Design a protein around this ligand. Structure first.
Ligand SMILES: [Zn+2]
Length: 56
RNA sequence: AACAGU
């Protein structure tokens, strides 16, 4: 015999389709004030800004 | 994955 399972459907709080992602809420760390594109927890690298060293 | 918003 086994008694273990999950079956329930209930949720509160309004939301279109992106949690409480405020227009001024970072969608990365969840910090309000800065945008994800400006998240201080964003990645960086690899250090080496060299797309194409042309000669002209 | 941590971008759910050019
Ligand atoms: Zn952030």
């Amino acid at each position: 015999a086994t008694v273990v399972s999950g079956q329930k459907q209930d949720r509160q709080g309004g939301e279109r389709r992106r949690s409480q992602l405020d227009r001024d809420q970072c969608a990365y760390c969840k910090e309000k004030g800065h945008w994800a594109k400006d998240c201080p927890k964003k990645p960086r690298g690899p250090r080496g800004p060299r797309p194409q060293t042309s000669l002209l």
